Design a protein around this ligand. Structure first.
Ligand code: FK5
Length: 117
């Protein structure tokens, strides 16, 4: 599978690992449920929703997650599992997460869109 650009500058992109069960996409304002695993561009894992044994839930389009996630999940179909490359300016930018993510880090995310309400 190939990288598919999500943004106009083609820097936010995804790889479809598993195609969705239908062509439904979540509307703005949906409470979306996902599985995810985050890694650095070295492959090292820094977090995964599986580590807490339940899906991760956030409201789409509200801006409570990093820009790459709002734009990325909005492009996904129900049931789709994709692999995202999120540049720093689509994530935490020049900020660092203590002990986990250095400043100006590209983030790799494996996201599976389970459902939404
Ligand atoms: C009350 C506070 C704690 C509250 C924590 C939770 C509900 C639990 C939830 C599973 C987060 C994880 O906690 C185990 C943990 O997930 C990471 O490890 C991670 O994988 C990540 O990157 N995620 C989480 C999954 C969605 C994308 C992204 C995100 O957008 O996360 C959001 C994020 C950090 C946004 C910042 C907010 C500040 C802005 O300035 C910045 O803008 C540049 C963007 C998270 C969801 C926030 O909305 C909510 C919180 O912070 C972060 C690396 C650090 C984060 O712990 C803090």
């Amino acid at each position: 599978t190939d990288w598919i650009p999500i943004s106009q500058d083609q820097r936010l992109k995804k790889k479809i690992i598993t195609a969705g069960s239908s062509d439904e996409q979540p509307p703005i304002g949906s409470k979306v449920s996902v599985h995810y695993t985050g890694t650095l561009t070295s492959g090292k894992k820094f977090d995964s929703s599986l580590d807490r044994g339940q899906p991760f839930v956030f409201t789409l389009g509200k801006g409570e997650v990093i820009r790459g996630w709002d734009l990325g999940v909005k492009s996904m179909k129900k049931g789709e599992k994709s692999y995202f490359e999120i540049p720093s300016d689509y994530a935490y930018g020049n900020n660092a997460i203590p002990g986990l993510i250095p400043a100006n880090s590209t983030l790799m995310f494996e996201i599976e869109l389970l459902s939404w309400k």
